[PDB]
Design a protein around this ligand. Structure first.
Ligand code: ATP
Ligand code: ATP
Ligand code: ATP
Ligand code: ADP
Ligand code: MG
Ligand code: MG
Ligand code: MG
Lengths: 48, 464, 516, 349, 50, 93, 348
């Protein structure tokens, strides 16, 4: 996180059971998320 | 979890909910009202989100006697009404409770009131020559089976009488199921209609649903949707022909305008609510016949102060195919059906599918009436003595024809002692050809008023 | 199982090619909704008219900006919208996929195949908003764009690149004229090179689905379905589709025009679009004006109807023609939109209802209609044959107003009255019957020279028809000549005179009398 | 509580119409020049109610129910709330009895039957009051006999009229002798907007109490446009947004809520019945105004009166071309329909 | 043309069971290697071999 | 040729049932595989490692700037004044 | 210095500025569009002072792809037009850029569009007769020097030939040059006029200004002012008498009413702007002749709904001297002027 953003970054973690794995980070408006459920839904919705 | 009430005004009520508890749009809500003598159960339907966990909605019951701080509960579901074969021969209100028996019909399956219009890929035009026993509709604007039919006109012109006569003439010769819906009308009319239907055996074959005008505007806006739900359920699964009659359409647009005045939206031209056309189009798309299923609908539309420039009638005209309107000038003249042929039109009237004689007769009579309407003012001012021979002959022929379109009906028995009379199509065609040829001009004025058949015309002629 | 093998191969090829990337983007949240619009906050930088994306699959566009709020319009389904959803900024200004496989199909205003036919191919994406051709890339207008109607091309000619307007009252027959014009070009399509070929498009706004089905059936029976496409926005759709369809139609037509193929845009109705825009603007809480209309409404039309124009030979010499249709009520023209659209275009065709009530079926008014281009868009032969019958008709009606009750007149006055009555009775025509140029010229020449002045006015039309049929059967040289040289020769005139005389010698309707 | 009566220190009474988050709007009924900031307000725990009794006959009271001109007080058995529910469809019954009137034209063209509402419109200086007065006076001969099945009790309501006019009407009734079986509710123009807005509901409740007991009741409204004007003024003063022609949007609804109670009960609940003759004014015989258009649609018949006919020589001055009754010939006696029939067609032709 | 339309309707009422006859064996043979396709999909999704 | 078009439409109905079957099988089998095979806790940490690698290889990004203008200026002035005027504050002062 | 946009709606744009750099009324502001497919530069004018260093402007080009936070610079001057002897050789719109090529540049002088009418003292105290080459016009409807003349007619009645006749007559007889300023003119008609004036060998000594429909109302309202400023420069610098041509006046008032209603003012007097007389007088006050030179103009006005008591024609007719009519019956007679002597008159 300090590599991508020059300023130091604090950490606040919230435990979520819905996701089957992965990790998500939110630094404000920008968001990054890698989740099994999200990938499965994205693959399913583009099936045809 | 439950919310509270913070503001109350008119029919609109807004409520507050805790986090993660706001319901989606169009969800029923229940509220409790207590008093020494006024105890009820308020039913509300969600209208819009105001943010900050606040939702504003309307009510289907009078809001008299409510106090702030009363909890409001949610069912998490939409409005529903029981359906099935047992619905036949009963009277229901908007909410679906049976008015005849308080406990009847509380065990059938239930369907949500909100639905989706059928897809465009399954549309097919319907063309059929459906014939009644009335001269004007038979000749000028024939009705279409499985299509839209509607009326027009101001107050006190006689649309309800025509609807009653039409249903009396058709329901006796139908093998399908008919459903009657009353949006706005006096209670006396509904009671008399129920008694008249009970006078025969047809009541067991039809289902009635209606709400009156004294109720709050919430109820007047929802009866049509319930009627459409019942009709759609009957059509979709049974695969049977259905008949649908609507007393009025202006009423629910009026209710929408009233509620949108308070909801907080800006007004528009002639003080009408915005997006009225969208709602009208969304509702009117439900009544449609697919390739394998046919449904025939007859509607009546009211106009304010006989003004066709009003945006609402102009908008609702575009959804019709076969139309017949009424005028007040002909009513003041004396003719009872009071149908104006000049402006009315149909959508199956062409020699491609109809015999050419019909087309020729219609064109000739329309031209004659148009010429008479043109010569009106000169005849009134300078008098008949100023015109030439051709103009005088056309004036006499126009008078004869205009008198001849009148006809007595059975529904006039209560008002006049004359009994009913019905005439087929071919006889009317031949009679109109004879009249437009000009071989009946020797008869007096009164011989052509209130005449059913040609033999009746001859008998009246011998009576003077 | 060859089809099964193909299905399995396609499924395996798609599934083995799955790939995705982890990239950052800005996401905002909805704060309120209802009545077809919703408010979204949290998006730092979004272009105006951006195509947003919603978690449920519904779409939307951004119209109104603010310091801490963004307005939006929901296009498709609306009930899935609720507080708590997350929006995702995607892509850029919306566009339309245009190509050449759109022919003979019906598409969603957004570019989806609502028809029962399978999916369509795509060629290239074009954004709706682009600048119109400049003032230094146009030529003069000179081309005989036929219409198949005697009255229209006799009175008010139409050429390529010319915007012509049709304003009518309720139940008059505008759509019939439009359909006749749209299907008149079967013979033109049948020719080999695309110099005569025209690719036509149709747009339908705020109409019942059954009417669209009937129109499609009529066109299919006519056989012109092969070179046309339909865009449909029925009443069941939200306001967004009704607002946005004409831009899609114009862009699709413009792509064809830009590459050197002649096209023909037709707008079914413009009042509905104005009403939808007014509803959206009022719902977005913008200042109102006269007749509850926003100020910019006029500008709207100027942005849309001005796309079509003739091109120069440097860019390929394409063309585009528009036929907007306007509906007026109570025979009133002083209304806002009618005045604006009249002042923005050139050429008008008024459709009275009194004329349609009796007599003339086309029911086109003559004393008010006008065409700006005029003779610059005419054929030389029919221009010569025209003989300035406008003044003849004008003085004919003026005199026949007087002579209704007058029996003693000047002989020349009686002759002029009879000629005018004969021409008026000739000018009528039934529906679904287009006419080619040569028979129109022949009929007009027959009318002008006074050959039929001896024919009783009650049964002229039938007689005329018979003559035409006979002329088509036992004679073919005159048609070839008029097709090859586009001019009427004196010897052909003499031969036609002989044919007319010999045919009229042997025709009777009721106590008739063949005369010199 | 919504629409709950509230007490005030000076003795006046108020009504809370709309309830905001932190404030309550109220309208003052009586004298309101003795109201200042810092007073005390108390709740009575009861919804707007009016006393009812049989001693009201032959007297005059204010809309609240306290006599103003008469001597003494009123013994009222019960008090009932203004807002109630109209009878449903299942509790109703058809109409067959006739209501005789002295004017031959009215019964000849458009008969009036019990349980049927009739509307009277026309311009100024036409003579519409005389019809109602003549009907009320004509009821005396029927009232002479004591049978409960042939007795009619009538109520007069006046809105926005000079007191001397009410006195003259009272004098005419006294000379006619009908004052034994009639009552008057007076709301002179000098009063505030509350009484003008509230009087007709009080009259309707007073009539309804007798209607439930099985006695036939006649109701006559003098003016109805004045009530609409008063409601418009109240709504505009209460900062409610306006609508078409500066009128509040829901005005039509109000009229419906007043004109639906009048009906005829079924045999199970008794032979009680109600009739009404509301009067609507107009200017220059113009129907384009939306108030007449709204009020026609909920009536069973109307009579048009033109000044040109009045000056022509026709004293009743009714226009047979447009006047019509929806009930028809079922109301009139059989002998009348045998002798008289289809006369309106003859007159129009 | 009406008789030809009737013949076309007969052809349609033959094809409406022809495709069902084909689809019976299509459905019979669909799940032959469906497990392999699902395994490939899962391996691609997880990013590692299954 | 229209009947041939409906033959292609029937093939499209076969495509419809193909899509339905493919969707059902993909949903069921993939969901069961992901929720059964790799549901062991010892796998979870491994997944995290993979994600870290992605966060290691992503390109750099520029981040700046983390209510009225006059209020903002006044607040900045007050903050500067506090900073200049809090030099001598004690533990309890 | 730099400023940031705050809110965007329609063509109306709000901007914010630091404390000490607030621009005054009627200035010019520039901005850029980053998007590649819609690369463009935007010009704006200042019309109101909302307070708290917030300015509400109007854009002369359509707004699309604009992004919040984009910097805005300041020109420091009003709308400028190029003036010099190199004018009248080509065509260009209000912004001044030549449409045929961008070859012309900032070489000429630049003058502000906004000016003031002449003072009261130096006004000419006497009228002057103006003579032409047409017999019927001079005999029946005299033309007042420095006046305003209205013409009513249509197409096919010999109007364009009359305009060309007058242009060549003034160019050759008394010298000088004349300018043409089409407001709200359709593109194809403009191209046809350009080609025809090229063919008639009178294109050398005329300056053409165009206003297109596709543009927002700002250009449609400023084009006439720009053209009048150009004519004023010619008159006051060269000493040559000039003639001004205006196609329509109804569209000017239409654009005025539109720009009035977009700024959220209150309409009055049959849906019109409340100050139309002020703008009409400000436009018409710069036509009178002074200092021995004349600026004669010709207009064509359109009456709506055949009503002569409508506010716009009523205000327009207050500054009129001569009226001319054309019809078809006189053309059916077959004569050149095609002017009806029974429907035309003058005030002199
Ligand atoms: N054909 C007819 N036979 C007998 N009476 C008729 C006929 N047509 C109209 N009337 C008379 O005209 C009036 C019409 O009554 P009605 O209330 O049905 O009117 P309407 O215009 O259809 O309005 P609404 O919807 O309120 O019922 C009645 O007085 C009725 O007697
Ligand atoms: N030349 C003609 N001869 C005979 N009938 C005609 C002719 N032209 C049109 N009609 C008839 O006139 C009617 C016009 O219908 P059409 O579909 O054109 O509607 P429209 O008048 O354009 O109105 P709208 O679009 O509002 O429905 C139809 O009944 C059509 O058959
Ligand atoms: N049949 C009649 N014959 C003669 N005069 C009559 C007749 N009917 C009414 N009048 C007279 O016409 C006038 C109408 O008086 P009335 O008070 O009833 O007026 P109105 O039109 O009802 O007005 P308002 O109640 O608004 O004052 C009186 O002078 C009355 O005597
Ligand atoms: N007096 C005239 N003599 C001969 N031809 C004329 C005369 N006036 C006009 N015309 C012809 O009419 C056509 C239209 O001219 P004009 O009316 O000036 O343009 P517009 O029709 O665009 O107004 C021209 O091509 C010209 O040849
Ligand atoms: Mg009725
Ligand atoms: Mg049409
Ligand atoms: Mg009176």
């Amino acid at each position: 996180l300090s590599r991508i953003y020059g300023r130091p970054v604090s950490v606040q973690l919230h435990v979520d059971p819905e996701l089957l794995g992965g990790l998500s980070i939110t630094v404000g408006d920008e968001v990054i998320d890698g989740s099994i459920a999200s990938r499965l839904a994205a693959a399913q919705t583009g099936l045809p | 979890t439950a919310g509270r009430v913070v503001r109350i005004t008119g029919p609109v009520v807004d409520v507050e909910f805790p986090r993660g508890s706001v319901p989606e749009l169009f969800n029923a809500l229940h509220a409790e009202i207590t008093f020494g003598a006024l105890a009820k159960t308020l039913t509300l339907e969600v209208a819009q989100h105001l943010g900050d966990s606040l939702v504003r909605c309307i009510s289907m019951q009078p809001t008299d006697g409510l106090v702030r701080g009363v909890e409001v509960t949610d069912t998490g579901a939409s409005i529903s009404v029981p359906v099935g074969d047992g619905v036949k021969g009963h009277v229901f209100n908007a909410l679906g409770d049976c008015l005849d028996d308080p406990g009847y019909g509380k065990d059938f399956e239930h369907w949500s009131i909100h639905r989706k219009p059928p897809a465009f890929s399954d549309l097919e035009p319907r063309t059929e020559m459906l014939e009644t026993g009335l001269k004007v509709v038979d000749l000028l604007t024939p009705y279409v089976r499985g299509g839209k039919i509607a009326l027009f006109g101001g107050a006190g012109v006689g649309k309800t009488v025509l609807i009653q006569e039409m249903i009396n003439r058709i329901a006796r010769n139908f093998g399908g199921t008919s459903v009657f819906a009353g949006v706005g009308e006096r209670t006396r009319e509904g009671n008399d209609l129920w008694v008249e239907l009970a006078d025969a055996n047809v009541l067991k074959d039809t289902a009635l649903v209606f709400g009156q005008m004294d109720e709050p505007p919430g109820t007047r806006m929802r009866v049509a949707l319930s009627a459409l739900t019942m009709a759609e359920f009957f059509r979709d699964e049974q695969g049977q022909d259905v008949l649908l009659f609507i007393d009025n359409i202006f009423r629910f647009t009026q209710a929408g305008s009233e509620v949108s005045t308070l909801l907080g939206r800006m007004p528009s031209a002639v003080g009408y609510q915005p997006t009225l056309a969208d709602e009208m189009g969304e509702l009117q798309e439900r009544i449609t016949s697919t390739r394998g299923r046919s449904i025939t609908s007859m509607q009546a539309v009211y106009v304010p102060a006989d003004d066709y420039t009003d945006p609402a009638p102009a908008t609702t005209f575009a959804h019709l195919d076969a139309t017949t309107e009424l005028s007040r000038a002909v009513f003041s003249k004396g003719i009872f059906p009071a149908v104006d042929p000049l402006a009315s039109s149909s959508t199956i009237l062409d020699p491609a599918i109809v015999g050419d004689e019909h087309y020729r007769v219609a064109q000739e009579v329309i031209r004659i009436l148009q010429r008479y309407k043109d010569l009106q003012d000169i005849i009134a001012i300078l008098g008949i003595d100023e015109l030439s021979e051709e103009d005088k002959q056309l004036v006499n022929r126009a008078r004869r024809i205009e008198r001849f379109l009148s006809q007595n009906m059975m529904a006039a028995e209560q008002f006049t002692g004359q009994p009913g009379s019905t005439v087929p199509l071919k006889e009317t065609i031949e009679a109109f050809d004879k009249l437009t040829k000009g071989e009946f001009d020797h008869l007096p004025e009164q011989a052509f008023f209130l005449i059913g058949g040609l033999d009746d015309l001859a008998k009246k002629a011998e009576s003077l | 199982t060859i089809s099964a093998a193909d299905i399995e191969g396609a499924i395996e090829d798609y599934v083995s090619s799955f790939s995705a990337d982890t990239e950052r983007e800005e996401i905002g949240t909805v704060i309120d909704a209802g009545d077809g619009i919703a408010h979204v906050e949290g998006l730092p930088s979004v272009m105006t008219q951006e195509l947003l994306e919603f978690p449920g699959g519904v779409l939307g566009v951004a119209l109104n900006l603010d310091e801490h709020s963004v307005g939006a319009v929901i296009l498709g389904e609306f009930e899935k919208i609720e507080e708590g959803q997350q929006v995702k900024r995607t892509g850029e200004v919306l566009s339309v996929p245009v190509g050449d496989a759109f022919l003979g199909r019906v598409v969603n205003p957004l570019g989806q195949p609502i028809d029962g036919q399978g999916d369509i191919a795509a060629e290239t994406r074009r954004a709706l908003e682009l600048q119109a051709p400049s003032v230094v890339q146009r030529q003069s207008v000179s081309e005989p764009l036929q219409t198949g109607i005697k009255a229209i091309d006799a009175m008010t000619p139409i050429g390529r690149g010319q915007r012509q307007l049709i304003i009518g009252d309720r139940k008059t027959g505008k759509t019939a004229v439009c359909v006749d014009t749209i299907l008149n070009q079967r013979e033109a399509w049948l020719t080999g090179d695309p110099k005569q070929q025209v690719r036509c498009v149709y747009v339908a706004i705020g109409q019942k689905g059954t009417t669209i089905a009937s129109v499609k059936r009529a066109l299919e029976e006519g056989g012109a379905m092969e070179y046309t496409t339909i865009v449909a926005a029925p009443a069941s759709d939200a306001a967004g589709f009704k607002w946005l369809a004409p831009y899609t139609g114009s862009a699709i037509g413009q792509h064809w025009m830009y590459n050197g193929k002649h096209v023909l845009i037709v707008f079914d109705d413009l009042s509905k679009q104005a009403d939808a825009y007014r509803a959206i603007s009022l719902l977005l809480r913008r200042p109102p004006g006269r007749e509850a209309f926003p100020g910019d409404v006029f500008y709207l039309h100027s942005r849309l109807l001005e796309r079509c124009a003739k091109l120069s030979d440097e860019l390929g010499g394409g063309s585009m023609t528009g036929l907007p249709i306007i509906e007026t009520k109570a025979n009133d023209i002083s209304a806002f939109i009618p005045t604006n659209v009249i002042s923005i275009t050139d050429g008008q065709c008024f459709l009275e209802s009194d004329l349609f009530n009796q007599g003339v079926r086309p029911a086109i008014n003559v004393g008010v209609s006008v065409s700006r281009v005029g003779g610059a868009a005419q054929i030389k032969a029919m221009k010569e044959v025209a003989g300035s019958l406008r003044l003849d008709l004008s003085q004919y009606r003026e005199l026949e107003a007087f002579a209704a009750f007058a029996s003693d007149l000047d002989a020349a006055s009686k002759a002029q009255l009879d000629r005018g009555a004969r021409l008026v009775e000739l000018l009528k025509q039934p529906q679904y019957s287009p006419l080619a140029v040569e028979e129109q010229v022949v009929a007009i020449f027959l009318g002008t020279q006074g050959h039929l002045d001896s024919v009783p006015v009650e049964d002229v039309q039938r007689f005329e028809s018979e003559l035409l049929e006979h002329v088509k059967a036992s004679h073919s040289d005159i048609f070839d000549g008029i097709r090859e040289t586009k001019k009427l020769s004196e010897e052909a005139e003499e031969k036609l005179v002989s044919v007319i005389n010999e045919f009229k010698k042997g025709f009777q309707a009721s106590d008739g009398s063949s005369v010199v | 509580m919504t629409q709950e009566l509230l007490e005030f220190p000076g003795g006046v009474l108020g009504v809370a119409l709309n309830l905001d988050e932190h404030s309550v709007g109220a309208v003052i009924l009586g004298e309101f020049e003795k109201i200042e900031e810092g007073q005390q307000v108390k709740r009575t725990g009861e919804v707007l109610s009016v006393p009812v009794g049989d001693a009201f006959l032959g007297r005059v009271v204010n809309p609240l129910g306290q006599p103003i001109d008469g001597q003494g007080d009123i013994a009222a058995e019960t008090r009932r709330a203004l807002e109630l529910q109209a009878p449903s469809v299942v509790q109703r019954q058809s109409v067959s009895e006739p209501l005789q009137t002295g004017i031959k034209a009215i019964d000849a063209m458009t008969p009036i039957g019990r349980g049927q509402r009739q509307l009277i419109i026309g311009d100024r200086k036409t003579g519409k009051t005389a019809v109602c007065v003549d009907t009320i006076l004509n009821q005396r001969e029927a009232w002479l006999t004591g049978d409960p099945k042939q007795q009619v009790r009538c109520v007069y309501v006046a809105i926005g009229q000079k007191g001397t006019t009410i006195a003259s009407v009272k004098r005419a009734l006294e000379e006619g002798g009908a004052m034994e079986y009639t009552t008057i509710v007076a709301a002179p123009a000098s009063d505030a907007a509350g009484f003008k807005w509230l009087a007709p509901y009080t009259g309707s409740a007073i009539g309804q109490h007798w209607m439930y007991n099985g006695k036939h009741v006649l109701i006559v409204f003098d003016d109805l446009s004045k009530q609409a004007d008063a409601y418009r003024a109240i709504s505009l003063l209460l900062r409610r947004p306006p609508g078409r022609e500066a009128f509040p949007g829901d005005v039509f609804y109000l009229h419906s809520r007043l004109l639906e109670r009048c009906a005829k009960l079924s045999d199970e609940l008794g032979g009680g019945s109600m009739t009404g003759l509301p009067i609507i004014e107009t200017k220059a015989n113009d129907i384009s105004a939306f108030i007449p258009t709204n009020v026609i649609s909920i009536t069973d018949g109307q009579c048009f009166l033109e000044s040109d006919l009045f000056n022509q020589g026709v004293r009743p001055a009714i226009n047979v071309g447009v006047s019509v009754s929806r009930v028809g010939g079922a109301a009139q006696i059989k002998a009348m329909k045998e002798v008289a029939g289809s006369l309106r067609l003859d007159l129009s032709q | 043309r009406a008789q030809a339309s009737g013949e076309v309707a007969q052809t349609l009422t033959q094809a409406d069971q022809q495709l069902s006859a084909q689809g019976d064996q299509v459905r019979s043979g669909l799940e032959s290697s469906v497990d392999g396709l699902s395994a490939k999909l899962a391996s691609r999704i997880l990013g590692v071999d299954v | 040729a229209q009947g041939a078009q409906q033959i292609q439409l029937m093939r499209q109905q076969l495509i419809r049932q193909l899509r339905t079957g493919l969707g059902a099988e993909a949903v069921n089998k993939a969901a069961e595989i992901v929720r059964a095979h790799v549901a062991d806790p010892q796998a979870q940490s491994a997944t995290v490692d993979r994600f870290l690698s992605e966060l290691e290889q992503m390109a750099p990004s520029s981040v700046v700037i983390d209510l009225r203008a006059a209020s903002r200026q006044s607040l900045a002035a007050l903050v500067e004044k506090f900073d200049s005027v809090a030099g001598g504050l004690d533990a309890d002062g």
